[PDB]
Design a protein around this ligand. Structure first.
Ligand SMILES: [Ca+2]
Ligand SMILES: [Ca+2]
Ligand SMILES: [Ca+2]
Ligand SMILES: [Ca+2]
Lengths: 203, 201, 213
């Protein structure tokens, strides 16, 4: 389940090397690229040192089990550097900015923005037309299914570097000031600020 | 123009496949790598499956319009994982650390450091010899061109996980305490701290 | 050790590595020793320094029909950590410099950033987008919350780094300032800025953090 996927560019007398079905070998007679588990590929490189004379190994993760979300057909905008796990629901015309991180089970509603370097923890739920500020953290609640995650209702603005703690609901149309730590449910149409966040105005 | 670029490693009887001008195909008879739009390349893979035996598709962005900054000739240091949009000015001898993010229109002065996981929003301006702390956020003001962005003057230290709000100027030589939220202009050569940030020293 | 870190950093030359996919009449091109060329007659890829490869592309323009240049860093001297043999879990997007110790069964989450000299103990979790500064030390069975920042120090070598002792929980978006020790079993509330040592088995909160329990 945990994997250490590598891509390996190779060159040499490749016709002399046979590759197992466990690895995807894209090669011609002298040069090629190999895709597979490092444990499998390492053995191949070692046992064929005579014919594979040079190689470059690329690797981006170690003992990782959860794949990344396939972005190619999503009806929304995902910028370079955003890391999104599989099993995340991205609503129509949402925007996921550079270097944001979104964990499994998260939901991002239609038209919502997750700004740069923001973090959505497991199952965090963001409604429609929300703005989750840069560096803001929505706590995760990976399991059980019955455990209330962070829920941000529609039309909410969450300030930069905010933290919303596990199981907290931010009510519709509310505003959370930058830097706040939200420890309790926020009533709809109110502005909260501080650590712990307190209501400072009714909208 | 929103794009969905892909890089596709491919193999098969590749001479039998004709690639359009829209696709850059670096291939030989047996194997190759294709660069282009997903819409374009998906069509090619499906229609030529008779000749394509296997492939691997890589993709890092979806419906993305703004390209990344070409770093190759910049007289500065940019570390792996830093994400910098095009139309950003990076001063001589600046340093951009791993996992920082710098949005369009930002300006970083000579000798300044943007630390790990810091965020410079749209049009945010940083002077010379500044240090923007890890995780600090300089709010963005993307438009209109007449809206004042965040302006950090020279010789400033911004603490880790600070937020400087839209349109605020942090004056020359000031220090902002870690975790502060700067909600109004900071006078030159003062220390501010707290949320909201208040003058201390 | 700290002296070794400083010496390593300065023995490393600044690099601008590229990967360049090329095609054309490549048999007419002689690639220099300084470049790794994985090529066939028709097409291939080149690994090397931009300054070296740019020269090649120019001087052989008549033989190179097209190319794509990839680059992810500029004037960068410290390489990334080889993850392939580490007995831990490191997720995509995590950026870890060489000369970092990752303890058995640790977890480094997506988009975390770990500077040179850092030490992460066994079974500890560094959560999403957290930052470990130079020489920052995290004990065993710790949890460093998402977005939390542990201060760094590289120079001088004698300077005290941030030390997180065992069994600690650091809340999300917390900042621990340089030289601070967070005591064994302590809990730091989300959003706190820790400005002085935290006694073991206490709870601290606020900015500046103060003992609450
Ligand atoms: Ca290797
Ligand atoms: Ca990243
Ligand atoms: Ca989580
Ligand atoms: Ca912005």
């Amino acid at each position: 389940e945990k994997k250490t996927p590598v891509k390996v560019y190779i060159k040499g007398d490749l016709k002399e090397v046979t590759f197992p079905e466990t690895v995807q070998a894209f090669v011609n007679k002298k040069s090629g690229v190999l895709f597979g588990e490092w444990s499998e590929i390492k053995t191949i490189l070692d046992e064929n040192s005579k014919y594979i004379v040079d190689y470059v190994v690329e690797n981006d993760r170690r003992n990782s089990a959860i794949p990344m979300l396939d972005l190619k057909g999503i009806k929304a905008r995902i910028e370079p550097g955003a890391i999104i796990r599989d099993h995340v629901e991205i609503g129509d015309n949402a925007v996921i900015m550079m270097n944001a991180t979104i964990n499994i089970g998260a939901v991002i509603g239609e038209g919502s923005m997750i700004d740069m370097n923001a973090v959505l923890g497991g199952r965090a739920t963001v409604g429609k037309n929300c703005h989750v500020g840069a560096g803001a953290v929505l706590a995760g609640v990976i399991e059980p299914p019955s455990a209330k995650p962070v829920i941000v209702e529609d039309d909410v603005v969450i300030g930069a570097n905010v933290v919303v703690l596990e199981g907290v609901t931010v009510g519709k149309g509310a505003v959370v000031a930058a830097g706040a730590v939200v420890t309790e449910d926020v009533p709809p149409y109110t502005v909260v600020a501080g650590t712990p966040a307190r209501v400072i105005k009714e909208i």
